[PDB]
Amino acid sequence: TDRVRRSEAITHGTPFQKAAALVDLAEDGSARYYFIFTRLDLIWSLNYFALLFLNFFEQPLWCEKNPKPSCKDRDYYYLGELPYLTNAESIIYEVITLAILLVHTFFPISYEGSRIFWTSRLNLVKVACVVILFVDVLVDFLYLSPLAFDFLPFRIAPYVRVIIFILSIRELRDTLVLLSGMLGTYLNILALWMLFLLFASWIAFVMFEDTQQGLTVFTSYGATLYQMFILFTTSNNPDVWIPAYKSSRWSSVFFVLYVLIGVYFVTNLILAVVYDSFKEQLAKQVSGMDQMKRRMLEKAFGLKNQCIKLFEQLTNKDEFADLCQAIALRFQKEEVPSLFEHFPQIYHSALSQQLRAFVRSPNFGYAISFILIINFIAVVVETTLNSAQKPWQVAEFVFGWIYVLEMALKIYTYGFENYWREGANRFDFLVTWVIVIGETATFWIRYLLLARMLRLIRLLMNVQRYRAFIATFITLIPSLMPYLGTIFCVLCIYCSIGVQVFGGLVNAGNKKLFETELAEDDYLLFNFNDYPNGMVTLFNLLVMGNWQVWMESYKDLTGTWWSITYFVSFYVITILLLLNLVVAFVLEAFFTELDLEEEEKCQGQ
Amino acid sequence: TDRVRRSEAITHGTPFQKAAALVDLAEDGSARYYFIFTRLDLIWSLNYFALLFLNFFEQPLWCEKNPKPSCKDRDYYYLGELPYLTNAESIIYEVITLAILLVHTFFPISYEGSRIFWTSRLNLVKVACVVILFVDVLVDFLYLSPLAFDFLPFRIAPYVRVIIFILSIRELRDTLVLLSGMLGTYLNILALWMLFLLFASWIAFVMFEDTQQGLTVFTSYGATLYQMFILFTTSNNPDVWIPAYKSSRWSSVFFVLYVLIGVYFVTNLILAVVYDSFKEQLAKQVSGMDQMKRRMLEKAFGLKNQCIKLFEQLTNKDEFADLCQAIALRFQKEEVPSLFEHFPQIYHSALSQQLRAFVRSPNFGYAISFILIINFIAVVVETTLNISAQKPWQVAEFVFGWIYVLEMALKIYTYGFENYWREGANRFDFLVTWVIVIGETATFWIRYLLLARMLRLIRLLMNVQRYRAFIATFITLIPSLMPYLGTIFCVLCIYCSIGVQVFGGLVNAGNKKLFETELAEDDYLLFNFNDYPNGMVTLFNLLVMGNWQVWMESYKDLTGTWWSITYFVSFYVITILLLLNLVVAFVLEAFFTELDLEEEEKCQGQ
């Protein structure tokens, strides 16, 4: 009842209650209308997701330019398995999600007020984008009628959807303010990297000029620079320099020195610079949150007798902020009473506490781990077979009951809340329900095998040593999520670009295609013909095993070197700036875990 | 004259000179015999290198089994270009390097004292290695005579050579001692990684069981585990899961998820762990060095006139340790008199100081760098014409060469030899300029002169004040990584030995299986283990991870035995996950040290 108590105290409470609520929620990290707005936050979140995802199901723009065969022949164009919305459906969902977007974007006026609403850059830009969207939707609708428009060259909506998405989920916007902080420092190292590629490709071009390497690979400075760029990635190693090696073994000493420097001395320098600027910008950013927290505590101060009255509320200016911080850092948050303490003879009679202490014992935990080991053995046995298996449906129900009981005993020992407040106990909760639902619905086969597999993670989580690594992993995941989301938004952009520029080129009637490395390596389903296909392709480009295959093949399908700029800038932005950020984040998380246990050790000693 | 002064002050000087030398050399980081042993250090180093390199030119043992055709047919066996030593040559060089090694390893037996010598375990292990080597050499010699032996199954010398080389250089031996502590950490994380591969391969196996992915790729648990291990490296992406994708696009979700987790979450974890353990051991090592430095200074103390008598020689108990620290850094250390001071009136004639001050001027720097820009433009014009027109540029190479000679002459005229060579930039200048002067004077084969004129450009990067921060990091990282790249090289050497013994001779033009392998299909046939060079390059290829499973598949198929994979798996586990992560860590620490040093310079200026 924390949120309800806070909002009630803020909107109706006496000033000491308002101050207590403000300080409590600052420690936890027109008020009425702000609450009314926030009560729809799930609607906003889901609508913005829908808004994005509806990008996946729209028909790709080249299918409307009357191809033969038509896009009903998905085998000819190597197309995905997702449906394409009809005109009707498109119109429907466009209208619905634009209407809810218009509701959300203007609803803050109820507490911000017009002068602030128009004074504020974020609202001004969101209104700009939703107008852009509405314009484009209108235009699209009009294009229903041939009177309005003959033809559309380009669709802006796919972009604006993405933009809108990024502006809606604040943590993505703050990640982009961090990234646009470090970007200017990243451009200097990217310039020194390009100066390195230039000079190394010029040495290679002079050195091999008349050789078979020059005659068949390094045929010009441009092609040398291209090849050396690829070799920076290591992706064309050794293939690129086989002609060299053939003519003289000594050539290897050049290719080895180039690879060693590029990979070891330079790529790690790019990581070091990204790591440094990330850490600086992160420290810069958190200071803003700390300052806003102080401003909120100063508001609570404004809104010895007063100290006694506030401590009385707590039972439920610089000195004030210092006291609030001291109590926040010293004290755990207050206990919440369970729904069962109201039954005096039931909840409180000594048998209850005896069973609680028993289930709270460590030897109970050992026994539970042994029972789950026995279940793991049982499933590893059962998967030797697939009617003799039928009793293992009873074994299924048996372990189902076992986990139902263990979940019940956990909620009995700690209420609903202090059971669940550990993320592992949340995983327990989820897998218990899903497997109970599956087993009772059976009373998929393979999917129940998979789920019972998935439940085995418990034995990993239990390992005391590994549990440090796992705690790193666990805090990492939701901390990583806004960076992978930014990556994904980038992929979305790139995908859109790709389908507009390259969509339709990979098809079974194309005589050039069967000369390309996509046809030769059988990558033909990794194409930009629709939004799914592209997305997957982009993942291959991201992990970057065989990446140059696509760059090459689309060079050859489009007939212009300019096409390369796509793949190059993709590489630059994704591989260098963002994945090194991911690296740095993982590193910092790990070391933070070690600093945490080091602090615990120091304070204990 | 530092070393000569120090050694004289120790072996002949008065105790005040002894202390002054011991403190100065400790700030700089039986005495007679130890100085002799150190003066021979170049001969020892060169002998140990020679001893190592021996591995390259020795004929590979499978050639000694009289194959048909013989190893004179290098095209049939895709062999290298290096010579193989004759028996005669082998015997010669072996005997010479063994004799010099015996000399070096026994040399301390006199000055260390027998009880001390044999009490030290490093000596004892070196003696075991040399005794082994001597044995093996003796055996090989005996083998010359039919009375001794019929056959030898395996040669140990190749290994022992490496071991001796590792022992011979303290920088490497300390690098391996540092490496040895973090191993027990490493084995943890390695265990967890194995467990993850196991689980993920099980899921993949069951999940795909009946599918085309199953029916063609994930044919068994074993086959699944092997393919999932290569997919952790991402070298078989997307190829390993094309049958899944073809069957159902949704399949992609599993492989994306798995690759995401493995590459980003888990590989970074191994890096993290490596990093951590590295830094811990590095701190332990530098602490041990600091303690040894203190222990030395404490003996130099054990060896107001109390102060003045030593503070005079300082121009050449915690109270003392503090003084030694302060005097190491609060003042500029000493300088050596120039060879010109036997002609001091000319050397001191005012024009010398005036020209030195001019050469020290910033406008002289501007002029010289403008001349370097002119030379860069000149060589660009030369190459953009050549792509007899070079003959004026062949003449201009005279001018440029003697300009770089003259400017180096002015550098030494302003800084002697001592403050010249004390600067790494001037050391690089010295390293390139004289060899280029030799090449160009010998000109007064052409592309090597063009390339020299290009290598003269390298300073233009180092002079950019922004990029100078990165380039200082790079310039200190170059000599600092040498222990670690040397240890990796030693590892490679071992692996190469193994490879030539186990796989040498299999890649040959008569082999019917070979033309079915991915080696032959990708034209990799030159990247083989048939001789030591070949294998070395192959190992490089392995190290770089480019197409690396090609070799593991092809040698699996050529040997017809799964066990062969143990070679390539152990190689990956050692090199890729332990060593290269180390290298990573080292570069990150170097860069952050550079930023801390610059921040200290900034804050002290502020």
User: What whole-number distance in Å separates Cα of residue B279 and Cα of residue B287?
Assistant: 12
User: What whole-number distance in Å separates Cα of residue B218 and Cα of residue B259?
Assistant: 17
User: What whole-number distance in Å separates Cα of residue A426 and Cα of residue A502?
Assistant: 45
Looking at residue A114, its amino acid is: S
Phi, psi of A574 (to 5 degrees): -75, -50
User: What whole-number distance in Å separates Cα of residue B195 and Cα of residue B188?
Assistant: 11
Q: Does A486 share its domain with A453?
A: no
Residue burial B119-128, b: 16+ Cβ < 10 Å; e: rest: eeeebeebbe
Q: Does A458 share its domain with A482?
A: no
For B547, which DSSP code?
T
Answer whether A272 sits within 8 Å of B188, measured CB to CB: no
Facing residue for B595 by CB, picked from A276, A536, A587: A276
Where would I find the H helices in B208-266?
Answer: 212-216, 221-232, 242-247, 252-260
The counts of H helices and E strands in chain A are: 30, 0
**A547 SS3 class:** coil
Structure-block tokens of residue A149: 């428009």
Q: Does B285 share its domain with B382?
A: no
Domain with B455 in it: what CATH number? 1.20.120.350
User: What whole-number distance in Å separates Cα of residue A261 and Cα of residue A267?
Assistant: 9
The span from the first CA to the last CA of chain A, in angstroms, equals: 39
Nearest chain A residue to B256 by CA distance is: A539
Q: Using an 8 Å Cβ cutoff, are A585 and A484 in contact?
A: no
Answer whether A263 sits within 8 Å of B544, measured CB to CB: yes
Q: Does B349 share its domain with B467?
A: yes
How many other C-beta atoms are found inside a 10 Å radius of the C-beta of residue A87? 11
Rg (Cα) of chain A, in Å, rounded?
Answer: 31
For B112, which DSSP code?
H
Breaks (C–N over 2.5 Å) after residues, chain A: 29, 303, 316, 386, 443
Nearest chain A residue to B478 by CA distance is: A265
Q: Does A358 share its domain with A379?
A: yes
Q: Does A443 share its domain with A484?
A: no
C-alpha angle with apex A211: A208 to A214, nearest 5 degrees?
A: 60
Q: Report the residue count for chain A.
A: 605
Q: Which of A123, A269, A74 is nearest to A188 (CA)?
A: A269
Phi, psi of A291 (to 5 degrees): -60, -45
User: What whole-number distance in Å separates Cα of residue B599 and Cα of residue B604?
Assistant: 8
Task: Chain B: give the shortest CA distance to residue A86, in Å.
Answer: 22
Structure-block tokens of residue A379: 């499933």
> The tokens 């992915």 sit on which residue?
B213
**Cα dihedral value B287, B292, B294, B297, nearest 10:** -160
Q: Which of A590, A330, A305 is nearest to A473 (CA)?
A: A590
Which of chain B's residues have a Cβ under 8 Å away from the Cβ of A268? 583-584, 587-588
Experimental method reported for this structure: cryo-EM
Which of chain B's residues have a Cβ under 8 Å away from the Cβ of A264? 580, 583, 587
User: What whole-number distance in Å separates Cα of residue B297 and Cα of residue B327?
Assistant: 13
User: What whole-number distance in Å separates Cα of residue A9 and Cα of residue A13?
Assistant: 4
User: What whole-number distance in Å separates Cα of residue A200 and Cα of residue A196?
Assistant: 6
Q: Using an 8 Å Cβ cutoff, are B176 and B122 in contact?
A: no
Q: What resolution in Å is listed for this PDB structure?
A: 3.5
Chain A interface disruption, residue of B455, B544, B549, most A CBs within 10 A: B544
Residue burial B534-554, b: 16+ Cβ < 10 Å; e: rest: bbbbbbbbbbbbbbbbbbbbb
Facing residue for B588 by CB, picked from A265, A268, A594: A268
Task: Chain A: give the shortest CA distance to residue B420, in Å.
Answer: 27
The counts of H helices and E strands in chain B are: 33, 0
User: What whole-number distance in Å separates Cα of residue A528 and Cα of residue A497?
Assistant: 9
User: What whole-number distance in Å separates Cα of residue A115 and Cα of residue A145?
Assistant: 40
Which of chain A's residues have a Cβ under 8 Å away from the Cβ of B457? 199
Where would I find the H helices in B330-466?
Answer: 344-348, 350-359, 362-386, 391-415, 418-421, 424-443, 447-455, 459-462
Q: Which of A596, A368, A369 is nearest to A460 (CA)?
A: A369
Q: Does A409 share its domain with A521?
A: no
Which of chain B's residues have a Cβ under 8 Å away from the Cβ of A545? 234-238
For B528, which DSSP code?
S
Looking at residue A340, its amino acid is: F
Q: Could you tell me the residue range of the domain that residue B438 belongs to?
A: 344-471
Answer whether A207 sits within 8 Å of B526, measured CB to CB: no
Q: Using an 8 Å Cβ cutoff, are B442 and B493 in contact?
A: no
In angstroms, what CA-CA distances link B520 with A189, A252, B205, B512? 40, 20, 30, 11
Structure-block tokens of residue B592: 């952050």
Looking at residue A213, its amino acid is: Q
Q: Does A357 share its domain with A367?
A: yes
User: What whole-number distance in Å separates Cα of residue B450 and Cα of residue B446?
Assistant: 6
Task: Chain B: give the shortest CA distance to residue A341, in Å.
Answer: 43
Facing residue for B238 by CB, picked from A207, A234, A540: A540
Answer whether A383 sits within 8 Å of B273, measured CB to CB: no
> The tokens 């004026």 sit on which residue?
B392
Q: Does A383 share its domain with A435?
A: yes
Answer whether A195 sits within 8 Å of B461, measured CB to CB: yes
Task: Respond yes or no on whether the N-terminal peptide bond of residue A69 is cis (omega within 30° of 0).
Answer: yes
Chain A interface disruption, residue of B56, B231, B256, most A CBs within 10 A: B256
Structure-block tokens of residue A75: 């085998």
Q: Which of A445, A449, A479, A458 is nearest to A406 (CA)?
A: A458
Q: Which of A600, A605, A577, A603 is nearest to A176 (CA)?
A: A577
Chain B interface disruption, residue of A75, A210, A252, A549, most B CBs within 10 A: A252
Structure-block tokens of residue A327: 């109590």
User: What whole-number distance in Å separates Cα of residue A23 and Cα of residue B375?
Assistant: 70
How many other C-beta atoms are found inside a 10 Å radius of the C-beta of residue B385? 11
User: What whole-number distance in Å separates Cα of residue A242 and Cα of residue B162?
Assistant: 30
User: What whole-number distance in Å separates Cα of residue B554 and Cα of residue B550?
Assistant: 6
**A503 contacts: CB under 8 Å, gap ≥ 6:** A60, A61, A62, A528, A529, A530, A534
Chain B interface disruption, residue of A257, A546, A598, most B CBs within 10 A: A546
Q: Using an 8 Å Cβ cutoff, are A530 and A60 in contact?
A: yes
Q: Does B275 share its domain with B349?
A: no
Task: Chain B: give the shortest CA distance to residue A319, in Å.
Answer: 32
Q: Does A499 share its domain with A423?
A: no
Facing residue for B192 by CB, picked from A466, A522, A579: A466
CB pairs A-B closer than 8 Å: 162
**A86 SS3 class:** coil
Domain with A502 in it: what CATH number? 1.10.287.70
Q: Which of A215, A196, A195, A192 is nearest to A205 (CA)?
A: A215
How many Cα atoms sit within 13 Å of B262 on the Cβ side?
25
